[PDB]
Amino acid sequence: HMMSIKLNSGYEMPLVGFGCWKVDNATCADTVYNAIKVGYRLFDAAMDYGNCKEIGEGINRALDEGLVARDELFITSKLWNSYHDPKNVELALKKVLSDMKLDYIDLFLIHFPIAFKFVPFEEKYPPAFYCGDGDNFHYEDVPLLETWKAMEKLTKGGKAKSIGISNFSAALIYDLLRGAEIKPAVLQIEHHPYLQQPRLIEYVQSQGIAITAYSSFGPQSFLELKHSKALDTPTLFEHKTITSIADKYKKTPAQVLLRWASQRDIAIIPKSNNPDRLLQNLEVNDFNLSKEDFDEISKLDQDLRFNNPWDWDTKNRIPIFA
Amino acid sequence: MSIKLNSGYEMPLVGFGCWKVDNATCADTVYNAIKVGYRLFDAAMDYGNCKEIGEGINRALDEGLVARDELFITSKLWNSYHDPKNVELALKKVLSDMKLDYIDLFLIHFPIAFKFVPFEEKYPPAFYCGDGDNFHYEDVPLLETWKAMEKLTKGGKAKSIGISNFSAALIYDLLRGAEIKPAVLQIEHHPYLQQPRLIEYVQSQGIAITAYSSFGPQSFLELKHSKALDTPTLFEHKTITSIADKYKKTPAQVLLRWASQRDIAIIPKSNNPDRLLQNLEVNDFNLSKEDFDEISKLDQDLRFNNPWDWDTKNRIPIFA
Numbered sequence A: 001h002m003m004s005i006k007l008n009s010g011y012e013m014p015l016v017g018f019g020c021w022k023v024d025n026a027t028c029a030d031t032v033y034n035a036i037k038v039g040y041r042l043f044d045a046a047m048d049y050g051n052c053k054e055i056g057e058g059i060n061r062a063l064d065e066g067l068v069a070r071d072e073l074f075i076t077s078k079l080w081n082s083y084h085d086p087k088n089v090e091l092a093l094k095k096v097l098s099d100m101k102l103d104y105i106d107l108f109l110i111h112f113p114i115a116f117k118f119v120p121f122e123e124k125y126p127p128a129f130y131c132g133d134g135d136n137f138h139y140e141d142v143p144l145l146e147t148w149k150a151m152e153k154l155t156k157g158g159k160a161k162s163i164g165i166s167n168f169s170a171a172l173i174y175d176l177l178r179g180a181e182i183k184p185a186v187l188q189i190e191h192h193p194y195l196q197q198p199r200l201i202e203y204v205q206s207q208g209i210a211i212t213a214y215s216s217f218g219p220q221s222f223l224e225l226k227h228s229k230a231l232d233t234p235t236l237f238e239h240k241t242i243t244s245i246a247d248k249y250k251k252t253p254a255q256v257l258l259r260w261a262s263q264r265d266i267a268i269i270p271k272s273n274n275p276d277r278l279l280q281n282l283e284v285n286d287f288n289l290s291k292e293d294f295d296e297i298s299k300l301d302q303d304l305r306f307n308n309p310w311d312w313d314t315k316n317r318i319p320i321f322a
Numbered sequence B: 001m002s003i004k005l006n007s008g009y010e011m012p013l014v015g016f017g018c019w020k021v022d023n024a025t026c027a028d029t030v031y032n033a034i035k036v037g038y039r040l041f042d043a044a045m046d047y048g049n050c051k052e053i054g055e056g057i058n059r060a061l062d063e064g065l066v067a068r069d070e071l072f073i074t075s076k077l078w079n080s081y082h083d084p085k086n087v088e089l090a091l092k093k094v095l096s097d098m099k100l101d102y103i104d105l106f107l108i109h110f111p112i113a114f115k116f117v118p119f120e121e122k123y124p125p126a127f128y129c130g131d132g133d134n135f136h137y138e139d140v141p142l143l144e145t146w147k148a149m150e151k152l153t154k155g156g157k158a159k160s161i162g163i164s165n166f167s168a169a170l171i172y173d174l175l176r177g178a179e180i181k182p183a184v185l186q187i188e189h190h191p192y193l194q195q196p197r198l199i200e201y202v203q204s205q206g207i208a209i210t211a212y213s214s215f216g217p218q219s220f221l222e223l224k225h226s227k228a229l230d231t232p233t234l235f236e237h238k239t240i241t242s243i244a245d246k247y248k249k250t251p252a253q254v255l256l257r258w259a260s261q262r263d264i265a266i267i268p269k270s271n272n273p274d275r276l277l278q279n280l281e282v283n284d285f286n287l288s289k290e291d292f293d294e295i296s297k298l299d300q301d302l303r304f305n306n307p308w309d310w311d312t313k314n315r316i317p318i319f320a
Helices: A025-038 A052-064 A086-100 A144-156 A170-179 A198-206 A240-248 A253-262 A275-282 A291-298 B022-037 B050-063 B084-098 B144-153 B168-174 B196-204 B222-223 B238-246 B251-260 B273-278 B289-296
Strands: A002-008 A011-016 A042-044 A074-079 A107-112 A160-166 A184-190 A212-213 B003-004 B011-012 B040-042 B074-079 B103-108 B156-163 B186-189 B208-212
Touching: A011 A074, A011 A275, A025 A052, A052 A086, A074 A086, A074 B103, A086 A107, A086 A144, A107 A144, A107 A184, A144 A170, A170 A198, A170 A291, A170 B168, A198 A212, A212 B003, A240 A253, A240 A291, A253 A275, A253 A291, A253 B273, B011 B074, B022 B050, B022 B273, B050 B084, B084 B103, B084 B144, B103 B144, B103 B186, B144 B156, B144 B168, B196 B208, B238 B251
Parallel strands: A042 A074, A074 A107, A107 A160, A160 A184, A184 A212, B040 B074, B074 B103, B103 B156, B156 B186, B186 B208
Antiparallel strands: A002 A011, B003 B011
């Protein structure tokens, strides 16, 4: 019995899934398949990762070999910024289903509250930060609610069982719900002990919207730690608060960081090409953090965000987190 | 000194903030301020002193001390009137209360939409939503309210329109469906809450910024929002006082110049004629690049005007 979240859409989402963000294309199909074998059922994808095709190979391989049924899996993808124009939303979902070789996805998210200039799929895919003009960014004047209304229409046809958002601030969600007929089922955000955004969490969960975390391990390189305003922030794998808790339960820092989220009903999507870690991540809910552990971890919040589109376009700063 | 708004009109960089001015003395205070040389007056439907402000303005006008086109009157659409049909009714109420036939700037006070309350039932409604102490809200997207604000500029009853307490992410989205860019953004702004990227993005869009609470937190509950051990008032912060000492100025002048020198409009208040004249002298002195660097270190995201604390049942997350 793996844990799941009952979405407001009526469908169940596994609490612990496999994040395909940053997974290399060469090994992706095997990694996905080997994950399904281990027991993973949710797989987090996106139009911008560029491995949707390889993810599908792993899925359909498991389906063909009879390791699982389709309704047992939970497939997430994300509408990239280039396709916020309502005319291109349905086309984007078709593109996802085509690449992954699936008849439907379980969750389709607006990847960012950002609308790049539409780049035809034939011109470039994944478009990433290309907007039809070299390295220059260009944007479309498409309010988020217009894109959401197109997302709501997708659910009428079944091609997307549930719809959601990613990287939306609480203020944006607050306004979006004023015009939404269907509330988002899921909000995905950067979430780790250094970026805890407790009031965002409280408000979003108060609305019955599930939350998925990415970057659960926090910053792990120079530029990622450079966002800190403190003098010498360590990685959460070395922070004394994490290692002490980890040592106390004979768990790894990674398991503590993942359980810190899942135990608060925040879905996690870790990745791993290591068999021992792959099973450790899946069974991360085998121990319990105490009230005292949570109080100590809450002290680490320092508003350290290292996935910030502000750093994308230097000519027109993207202020979604400003 | 003034700043030319993207609407074409000039807004004085130093105004008189009528927020928290007592009704009994507001009219004389406003009138005396005009005599000293003040031209911008920052009002709001929720302040409860709109009539008294208009009294001081019209007293000066009747005496010929100033012409109406020399004054810049700002008011704010309270949260109860975000439903488009109530937007023009709200402005008409402001104009009637203040006894003026047009306003220079009309701001959406907050990105929050309370349940409408008829003007006869209670005015100003404040946090009343037609149900005792319970808060109730309306599903009116901000863009719908803005479209009604835009319509107000076509009839001249409001020369310019703007917003207040909007985050950059909200402005980013609002401009996607806006025919008229907001002319002004008013926000809490002080060395403890500098929001530098919000300032940069907003000013890069041609939008003027007005600061309130330029002196920072000055009481126990206001300072309590700090996560630090013992935050002092900015009047006694060593970074502020050292700058004031070497330039032979007051901490208040430093705090105000920290905003005005960056083209951020200020709206202090005072009943002291000498302090009133002092505040009008913007370019009396300048802060150095080093001064700005030292002051920037004080930013700690200390926000003490947060609607999160209004409704404990349905937390208002506009700053979360």
